Amino acid sequence: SGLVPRGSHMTSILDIRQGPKEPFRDYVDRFYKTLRAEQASQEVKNAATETLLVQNANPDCKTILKALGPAATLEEMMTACQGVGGPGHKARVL
């Protein structure tokens, strides 16, 4: 990008990274808010989104995100980071 002498609304989505023990819900809260104000066009930023979202997620969360895959949606990810999503299913642990 370029041609911007001044456009510092809040172009800093790069600083929005999920801590190793940080809830994905709080991560997305800041991520989405900042990305919404990111100085880029929708298709441009959304292309980065799919990468950054997983990239700046911690290994543990990232492992969960990958186990779901692109076949699952953000809503699923939000619940996935919260545990398994639904206990009493496959009585292996609980």
Partner: peptide, 14 residues
């Protein structure tokens, strides 16, 4: 799983 999906998540629930 893009900004699109992020928007639909806050706006709707599917």
């Amino acid at each position: 799983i893009t900004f699109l999906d992020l928007l639909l998540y806050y706006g709707k629930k599917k």
